[PDB]
């Protein structure tokens, strides 16, 4: 229940009804379409007599052009293949450019030689018109003009179906001039066994006549016969008899892409390096065209061995044996697949901005209750407990942020460490000079001036003093945690667990269940998208936070999803005491997640969020921390493995002093027994005699 037409060789056309003629086009002409009412139009585009493109127009709302050089254009814009829009699918099949519209009820193709073909479903039987004819049992009632007359002249018919446009208005074309050891090549259609199989189905006489015409027209050798033989073979295939020998019972080989070979009855659902197997549920008839050699596979239009097939990730191709990694896990490409590690990685709980959260299990949420809340605790061995104090941080009711943090360490003789606003620290209520190393606990100034805290290898924290807290746990705590950052079991789906042992589907009741004090108000509802309370802020909040999804972060968008950070940014900018600071904090938060996945973004610029350093220091997007301070000179045997990080650093030959000023190595003070000595200081004693030089 289908019919086929083709435009082929020099000038030839074969109707849906097997009437053949020659026509050198100069306009673009209607090949096929709905004749009484035009659901779609299929147009043959010509220049200087030659074909140049096949163009489909859908109603008047969409049009797509496919050129003989494989270029495609939609409207007036060039578009890359493969393509799909408005119910059309434009793709390679059997190495040849294909344009399918079987929702409308047609499919079309251009082969490597530039021959067009079109197939119409029986939906258009006796209901179509154009150069491909009128699609009915008769072949001789073709040549119907748009004037509705027959004509005996193919050029009156074809010019009657010419379509002018604003691109060019086109002349009535006319037959070319003519003046006519190769003739036997056309008689293969009659003489030669593979072609002779099809004589009960397709009469050779028109095709051999057209063959003799191309032998008159064409200036080449024996190859001048080949389009008529090819189109006869394709007509036989359409009539249901494939001519498997035709291309080697004759000298005629069709054009194919590099590394492919022409063959008959190529299957649809062609296998590729990247495609899962349909196990023969394709249920579609084979076609002629190019194939890769047997056992070789196609990849992105080129043939490669089955052992050569790349893997794909992040929209890119990688050869076998390539290792990628996500967090601590590595994925190795083998065959079509990634062999991916299955170990648990360090859990990064986060509190940031206007009380946005990330669970250890990567669940993002916002809560904005005001109380002391249990953020993260070892619920099994109680080796640590982290608590946050949340307060309203602007005039808005939705602007709520962490004011201070409290860490209780029962293993450290039940010490209580408070991380204060402005990045101060107190221990058991006493304010401490920040470089502290007593017991398993260590506390330090980060180059960001953020407080960093460590408690063995298995707990680390990083507090900015401005309501941002990052908590890192080793996999030793996996499954053991509790509080607002969840149970660290690798699953988002239970992070809203509560002390009652059920997961609240409401983030409000979840967060309320972790409040430490009974007179704190239960949060009744969390008002997402607070821009309604300050409508003046929404235009800037959108325009500014959209940078997170702009091209500047594009390298990061496949390393960390930007969508939670964009929601957090728009909330922050719409509802805080200074939206510029909240913008910079949200952008820094996403850039920090990128750096956690090893993607570094040059996102700062003079228009936004420059990290302007104190005098003598210089900004680095990435500098090494371990050798910045004079203390590093004074304890040069200390362990330090921390990664390169963003901050303000001294210029490459200078170390950083207690005043924050940058000093040469010879000018650093020396630190001994926790006590500070100037350059060239001497002391001598019954136990030791020592002197300060080069900060040591």
């Amino acid at each position: 229940s289908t019919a086929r037409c083709s435009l082929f060789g020099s000038d030839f056309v074969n109707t849906f009804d097997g009437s053949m003629y020659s026509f050198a086009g100069y306009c673009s002409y209607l090949l096929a379409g709905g004749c009484q009412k035009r659901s779609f139009s299929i147009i043959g585009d010509f220049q200087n007599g030659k074909r140049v493109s096949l163009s489909v127009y859908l109603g008047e709302f969409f049009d797509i052009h496919l050129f003989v050089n494989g270029t495609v254009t939609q409207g007036d814009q060039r578009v890359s293949m493969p393509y799909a829009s408005k119910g059309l699918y434009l793709e390679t099949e059997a190495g040849y450019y294909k344009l399918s519209g079987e929702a409308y009820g047609f499919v079309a193709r251009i082969d490597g030689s530039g021959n067009f073909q079109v197939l119409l479903s029986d939906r258009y039987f006796n209901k179509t018109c154009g150069l491909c004819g009128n699609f009915n049992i008769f072949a001789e009632d073709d040549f119907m003009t748009q004037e509705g007359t027959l004509t005996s002249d193919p050029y009156d018919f074809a010019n009657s179906w010419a379509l002018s446009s604003g691109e060019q208005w086109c002349e009535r074309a006319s037959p070319p001039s003519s003046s006519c050891g190769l003739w036997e090549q056309c008689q293969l259609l009659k003489s030669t066994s593979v072609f002779a199989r099809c004589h009960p189905l397709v009469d050779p006489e028109p095709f051999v006549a057209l063959c003799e015409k191309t032998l008159c027209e064409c200036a080449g050798g024996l190859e001048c016969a080949c389009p008529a033989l090819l189109e006869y073979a394709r007509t036989c295939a359409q009539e249901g008899m494939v001519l498997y020998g035709w291309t080697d019972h004759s000298a005629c080989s069709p054009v194919c892409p590099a590394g492919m070979e022409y063959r008959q009855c190529v299957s649809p659902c062609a296998r590729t390096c990247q495609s899962l197997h349909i196990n023969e549920m394709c249920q579609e008839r084979c076609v002629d065209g190019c194939s890769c050699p047997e056992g070789q596979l196609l990849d992105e239009g080129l043939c490669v061995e089955s052992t050569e097939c790349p893997c794909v990730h992040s929209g890119k191709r990688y050869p076998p044996g390539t290792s990628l990694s996500r967090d601590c896990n590595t994925c190795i490409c083998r065959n079509s697949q990634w062999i991916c590690s299955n170990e648990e990685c360090p859990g990064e709980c986060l509190v940031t901005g206007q009380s946005h959260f990330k669970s250890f299990d990567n669940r993002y949420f916002t809560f904005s209750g005001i109380c002391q809340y249990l953020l993260a605790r070892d619920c099994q061995d109680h080796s640590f407990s982290i608590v946050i104090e949340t307060v309203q941080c602007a005039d808005d009711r939705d602007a709520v942020c962490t004011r201070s943090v409290t860490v209780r360490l029962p293993g450290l003789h039940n010490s209580l460490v408070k991380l204060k606003h402005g990045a101060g620290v107190a221990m058991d209520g006493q304010d401490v000079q920040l470089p502290l190393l007593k017991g398993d606990l260590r506390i330090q100034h980060t180059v960001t001036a953020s407080v960093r805290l460590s408690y063995g290898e298995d707990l680390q924290m990083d507090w900015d003093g401005r309501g941002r807290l990052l908590v890192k746990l080793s996999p030793v705590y996996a499954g053991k945690t509790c509080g607002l950052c969840g149970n660290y079991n690798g699953n988002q789906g239970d992070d809203f667990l509560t002390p009652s042992g059920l997961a609240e589907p409401r983030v409000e009741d979840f967060g309320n269940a972790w409040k430490l004090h009974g007179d704190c108000q239960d949060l009744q509802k969390q008002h997402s998208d607070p821009c309604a309370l300050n409508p003046r802020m929404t235009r800037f909040s959108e325009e500014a936070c959209a940078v997170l999804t702009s091209p500047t972060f594009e390298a990061c968008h496949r390393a960390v999803s930007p969508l939670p950070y964009l929601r957090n940014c728009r909330y922050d900018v719409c509802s805080c005491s200074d939206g510029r600071e909240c913008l910079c904090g949200a952008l820094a938060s996403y850039a920090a997640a990128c750096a956690g996945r090893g993607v570094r973004v040059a996102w700062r610029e003079p228009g936004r969020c420059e990290l302007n350093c104190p005098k003598g220091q210089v900004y680095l997007q990435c500098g090494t921390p371990c050798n910045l301070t004079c203390r590093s000179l004074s304890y040069p045997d200390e362990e330090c493995n921390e990664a390169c990080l963003e901050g303000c650093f001294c210029p490459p030959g200078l170390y950083m002093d207690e005043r924050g000023d940058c000093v040469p190595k010879a000018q650093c003070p020396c630190y001994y027994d926790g006590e500070i000595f100037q350059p060239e200081d001497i002391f001598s004693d019954h136990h030791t005699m020592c002197y300060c030089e080069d900060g040591f």
């Binding site: 408005k86 793709e91 659902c269 992040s314 996500r326 299955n342 409290t406 002390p499 409401r506 009974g518």
Partner: protein, 609 residues
């Protein structure tokens, strides 16, 4: 610091938490400003209080309040994956995501990895995105050699399956239902929101756009190439069936799609149109279920076909939310002549004339006894929206007569070691073994697992490729049957990595496998079947991990395979304890030769029960 305003004890909910850090007798806690015994405090859920001995139902599971905590049942409920819109999917694990696409994609399949697949379900938007019709999705179900297509509101069994005795096609309300077996079923909204339901017997066996059915949302978005993608578009593109078809274009989060894309004002009129999901009729469901995903879907599928009325895009999202609410037992009477109405009057315009039997219901019981369905079925859903025939007592519906009618109408080896052991096999997935050699290493592991009494009692086994990470295919706690565990061990894949860190696999066994000793009676042993060196810079912690394993009394057996095993690490393992006997081999071919003395050494180093 100018101030405009100025101004441990424990309570039933806080007692388990920290003290405030910023009042009753011992063994007592406050409730309602009165000190009371802890065993009288209520449990909390939905933020509501329930007394001890009160019971709550959560899905199929149920929990009784015991000593301030929920003492739950441990069932696995029937997991539902759903297409919830034109371009939105919800995995079996409840992860909502966005993935538009013109091609055909695997919604779910059983043909995952090594698993012999029983079925596929395929979906695609073919024939959408143009003016002349409202969009409809195709469905294609390929269970056990059959094929059922759902399209244009019709069901078409294009190929009979190998055993039809497990197969039923049903309709209830406005929903088609298909039962494909005891454990697989489909519920089809003719307006785009296709749904699939699986019992606990499937779980991690299935994969596709529905994710993989387990507890873990984070391991959905696993591509067909088995890598998790950060972007749902790349994940969904990996599940494209037709090899040549166009990959879905990746794009930024523009504020809304389609008709809203230029039109922020009209986008806010879409947002208000979707506020039906937050109206007082839904607000009781909005406790048990989050409206936000369905509202977001409503934005996308009303910015597609901007409406406050029954376009295929809009009202679908609210019918789907109402359906989910009804599965949570919260039936929602949401339709009216003002909003998304349905008329069953065409069903009452009968051959006798107009006669009431049908009407719309907010949810009718599904899979009812019918002349077309003479007995009850294992229906995947409790009830469904739409037209229902309110038949008088004992009468049976006939669908083809559209009317109520009378019910009279219509061991493997001689060595089989049985002793208290935990055993781990650590396999060098470097390039220093070819795949052909790694098959011999796998066969060695499998055949030792034929010679040990594999169980949670006696000998526990884990199997771990490392390949420059760590890759447990089996863990000690995996309660699967011994023939299943040997099957999985034989199905261990081959990485062939450029590096294989011996130190990091020792780290993995030290901290993640033996995280705590749960079997103090058992010996524990690691076969470090190592075939590659580490690059020197990685090795620095190696002695700390092996001596930590000695502190955790794990015996490490370094089996050095081939010339590229670094003998230094072999002997450094032996130096920690005499129990750490090395084996060193010229090739994998003599693994199967030394197997006897190896496995017997394991059993000599493990105590009898």
């Amino acid at each position: 610091m100018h101030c405009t305003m100025s101004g441990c004890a424990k309570t039933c909910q806080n007692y388990d938490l920290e003290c405030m850090s910023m009042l009753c007798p011992p063994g007592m806690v406050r409730h309602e400003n009165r000190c009371v015994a802890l065993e009288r405090c209520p449990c909390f859920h939905q933020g509501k209080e329930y007394a001890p001995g009160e019971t709550v139902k959560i899905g199929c599971n149920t929990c009784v309040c015991r000593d301030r905590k929920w003492n739950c049942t441990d069932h696995v409920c029937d997991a539902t994956c759903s297409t919830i819109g034109m371009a939105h999917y919800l995995t079996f694990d409840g992860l909502k995501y966005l993935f538009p696409g013109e091609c055909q994609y695997v919604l779910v399949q059983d043909y995952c990895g090594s698993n012999p697949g029983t079925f596929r379900i395929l979906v695609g938007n073919k024939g959408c995105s143009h003016p002349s019709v409202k969009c409809k999705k195709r469905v294609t179900i390929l269970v056990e050699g059959g094929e059922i297509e759902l399209f244009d509101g019709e069901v078409n069994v294009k190929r009979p399956m190998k055993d039809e005795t497990h197969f039923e096609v049903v309709e209830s309300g406005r929903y088609i239902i298909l039962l494909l077996g005891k454990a697989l079923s489909v519920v089809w909204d003719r307006h785009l929101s296709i749904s699939v339901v699986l019992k606990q017997t499937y779980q991690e066996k299935v994969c596709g756009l529905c994710g993989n059915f387990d507890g873990i949302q984070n391991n959905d978005l696993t591509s067909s190439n088995l890598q998790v993608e950060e972007d749902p578009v790349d994940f969904g593109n990996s599940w494209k069936v037709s090899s040549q078809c166009a990959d879905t274009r990746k794009v930024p989060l523009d504020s809304s799609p389609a008709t809203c894309h230029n039109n922020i004002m009209k986008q806010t009129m879409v947002d208000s149109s979707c506020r039906i999901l937050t109206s007082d009729v839904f607000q009781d469901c909005n406790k048990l279920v989050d409206p936000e995903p369905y509202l977001d879907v409503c934005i996308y599928d009303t910015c597609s076909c901007e409406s406050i009325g029954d376009c295929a895009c809009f009202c679908d999202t609210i019918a789907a939310y109402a359906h989910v609410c009804a599965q949570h037992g919260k039936v929602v009477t949401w339709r009216t002549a003002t909003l998304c109405p349905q008329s069953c009057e065409e069903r009452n315009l009968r051959e006798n004339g107009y006669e009431c039997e049908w009407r719309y219901n907010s949810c009718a019981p599904a899979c009812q006894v019918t002349c077309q369905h003479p007995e009850p079925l294992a229906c995947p859903v409790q009830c469904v929206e739409g037209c229902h025939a309110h038949c008088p007592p004992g009468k049976i519906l006939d669908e083809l007569l559209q009317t109520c009618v009378d019910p009279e109408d219509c061991p493997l080896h001689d060595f089989y070691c049985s002793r208290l052991l935990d055993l781990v096999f650590l396999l060098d997935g470097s390039s220093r073994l070819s795949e052909a050699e790694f098959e011999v290493l796998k066969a060695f592991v499998v055949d030792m697992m034929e010679r040990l009494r594999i169980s949670q009692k006696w000998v526990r086994v884990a199997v771990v490729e490392y390949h420059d990470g760590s890759h447990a295919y089996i863990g000690l706690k995996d309660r699967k049957r011994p023939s299943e565990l040997r099957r999985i061990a034989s199905q261990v894949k081959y990485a062939g990595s450029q590096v294989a860190s011996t130190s990091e696999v020792l780290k993995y066994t030290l901290f993640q496998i033996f995280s705590k000793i749960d079997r103090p009676e058992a010996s524990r042993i690691a076969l470090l079947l190592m075939a590659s060196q580490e690059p020197q810079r990685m090795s620095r912690n190696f002695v700390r991990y092996v001596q930590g394993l000695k502190k955790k009394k794990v015996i490490v057996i370094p089996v050095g395979i081939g010339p590229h095993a670094n003998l230094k690490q072999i002997r450094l393992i032996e130096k920690q304890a005499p129990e750490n006997k090395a084996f060193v081999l010229s090739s994998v071919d003599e693994l199967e030769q030394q197997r006897d003395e190896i496995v017997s050494y394991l059993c000599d180093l493990a105590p009898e029960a």
